[PDB]
Design a protein around this nucleic acid. Structure first.
Length: 176
RNA sequence: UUGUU
């Protein structure tokens, strides 16, 4: 129950409650919890035609999705069930690991940055913001695998040095 | 021109 994946499901009839939904999902594995997305803006509160299903096992979720997503169609819907891991399940977010690197020497490239930031973690992707058909814009984006990696790269290398052609010491901060 | 494709 530590690797479970909450699944967003869509296009289910608005008349269906947790009962019918549970009856739908249980053939694919045991269900820990299930909740219809409700609208309480006005009376009576109504279903949003979607729900969250939380299986006990990861296997149950992956399989249920594999056999339901774009396959199954509920009475009486015009479109197949849509099913995907829920937004609340995003333990890892690139936006919280991506590091903006300003005041980079215009001469530098991808690898030149890569070697500079290698000791603090493992790079997912390394890029040089540049152009449009000009040269480098003196700055780069760098994604680290963990987040603590980036939080190390910052403390260790923010304004650690001034590079070639640059007016101010290098900046290392989380991307906006 | 400190530049966040």
């Amino acid at each position: 129950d530590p690797d479970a994946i909450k699944m967003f499901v869509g296009q289910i009839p608005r008349s269906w409650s947790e009962k019918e939904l549970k009856e739908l999902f249980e053939p694919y594995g045991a269900v820990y919890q299930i909740n219809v997305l409700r609208d309480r803006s006005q009376n009576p509160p109504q279903s949003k035609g979607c729900c969250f299903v939380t299986f006990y096992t990861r296997k149950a979720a992956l399989e249920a999705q594999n056999a339901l997503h774009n396959i199954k169609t509920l009475p009486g819907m015009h479109h197949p069930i849509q099913m995907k891991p829920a937004d609340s399940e995003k333990s890892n977010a690139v936006e919280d690991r991506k590091l903006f690197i300003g005041m980079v020497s215009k001469k530098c490239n991808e690898n030149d940055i890569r070697v500079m930031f290698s000791p603090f973690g493992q790079i997912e992707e390394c890029r040089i913001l540049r152009g449009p058909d000009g040269l480098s814009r003196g700055c780069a984006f760098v994604t680290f695998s963990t987040r603590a990696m980036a939080q190390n790269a910052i403390k260790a290398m923010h304004q650690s040095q001034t590079m070639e052609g640059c007016s101010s010491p290098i900046v290392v901060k989380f991307a906006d």
